[PDB]
């Protein structure tokens, strides 16, 4: 039978889904280690691989399959339930089976998704530095109407130090930090001026290869909650621009404490989508 991971009602995605908004016909690209497209609780409609030797529709790491199910695990009588279980899901493989990738592969994936009409790009990846082409790619995606979401980073706090990674740190990109099921900041979650919102990231249960389900911790688990939440808002107001979706998630978040640690707080998609 179907488990509803705690993140889904914590962000109030269950309430939006119950009004009948589930992300139908919103295109979401998951830039990651690929997706196990044969998993019975996922429906991958397309994708691309910028990684040598691996197709887009297999996942030898498990990371991208897990991130994909938090966005879009099918609503049925098995496995788990995604935040937006009716989205059109695309696997854009920019990370190899060891979980890492090059800047030009990532840039390629961003461009691919912008060129192919994605509505939402999720990047559950980050690096300490970032590059020129990456900045342009995310800026061009956002100016073309794509909501761009990324994991803030799992560097924790460092006294006064901004520890947010790239691409989260670009202001075209929503930087997403992690809370647990008690809505407290997870310790590994990065902090800093660019931190925008928090979502579930500790103890997140989702699809995993092969055909199973697994619990992972990270701002990578938090990010897809916000990607799926973006898809829910668009399924309810299809004419909103990317700025408007982003400002709704931000400005309706539940305040949890200092924005250095929590951004504007915990997303609430019921309030955002209303
Ligand atoms: Ca399911
Ligand atoms: Cl299926
Ligand atoms: Cl590794
Ligand atoms: Cl610390
Ligand atoms: Cl910045
Ligand atoms: Cl708190
Ligand atoms: Cl508009
Ligand atoms: Cl707020
Ligand atoms: Cl306060
Ligand atoms: Cs499938
Ligand atoms: Cs592996
Ligand atoms: Cs289950
Ligand atoms: Cs924009
Ligand atoms: Cs730390
Ligand atoms: Cs709890
Ligand atoms: Cs608490
Ligand atoms: Cs902040
Ligand atoms: Cs739109
Ligand atoms: Cs609020
Ligand atoms: Cs406040
Ligand atoms: Na940002």
Swiss-Prot record:
Binds 2 calcium ions per subunit. It comes from Bacillus licheniformis. Belongs to the peptidase S8 family. Used as a detergent protease. Sold under the name Alcalase by Novozymes. It comes from the Bacteria. This is Subtilisin Carlsberg. One of its GO terms (molecular function) is serine-type endopeptidase activity. Ca(2+) 1 binds at residues 2, 41, 74, 76, 78, 80. Subtilisin is an extracellular alkaline serine protease, it catalyzes the hydrolysis of proteins and peptide amides. Shows high specificity for aromatic and hydrophobic amino acids in the P1 substrate position. May play an important role in the degradation of feather keratin. Keywords: Calcium, Hydrolase, Metal-binding, Protease, Secreted, Serine protease, Signal, Zymogen. The active site is at residues 32, 63, 220. Inhibited by p-chlorophenyl and 1-naphthyl boronic acid derivatives. Ca(2+) 2 binds at residues 168, 170, 173. GO terms for cellular component: extracellular space. Its cofactor is Ca(2+). It is found in: Secreted. GO terms for biological process: proteolysis.
């Amino acid at each position: 039978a179907q488990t509803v991971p705690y993140g889904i009602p914590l962000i109030k995605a269950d309430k939006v889904q119950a009004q009948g908004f589930k992300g139908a016909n919103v295109k979401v690209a998951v830039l990651d280690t690929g997706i196990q497209a044969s998993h019975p609780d996922l429906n991958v409609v397309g994708g691309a691989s910028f990684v040598a030797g691996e197709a887009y529709n297999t996942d030898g790491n498990g990371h991208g399959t897990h991130v994909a199910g938090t966005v879009a695990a099918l609503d049925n009588t098995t496995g788990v339930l995604g935040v937006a279980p009716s989205v059109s899901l695309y696997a854009v493989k920019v990370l190899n089976s060891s979980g890492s990738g090059s800047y030009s592969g990532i840039v390629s994936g961003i461009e691919w998704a912008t060129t192919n009409g994605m509505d939402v790009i999720n990047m559950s990846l980050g690096g300490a530095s970032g590059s020129t082409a990456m900045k342009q790619a995310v800026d061009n995606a956002y100016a073309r109407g794509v909501v761009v979401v990324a994991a803030a980073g799992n560097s924790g706090n460092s006294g006064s130090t901004n520890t947010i990674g790239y691409p989260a740190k670009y202001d075209s990109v929503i930087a997403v930090g992690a809370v647990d099921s008690n809505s407290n900041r997870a310790s590994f979650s990065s902090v800093g001026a660019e931190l925008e919102v928090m979502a579930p990231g500790a103890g997140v249960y989702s699809t995993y290869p092969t055909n199973t389900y697994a619990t992972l911790n990270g701002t990578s688990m938090a990010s897809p909650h916000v990607a799926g939440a973006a898809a829910l808002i668009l399924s309810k107001h299809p004419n909103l621009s990317a700025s408007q979706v982003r400002n709704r998630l931000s400005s309706t978040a539940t305040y949890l404490g200092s924005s250095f640690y929590y951004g504007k707080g915990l997303i609430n998609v019921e309030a955002a989508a209303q």
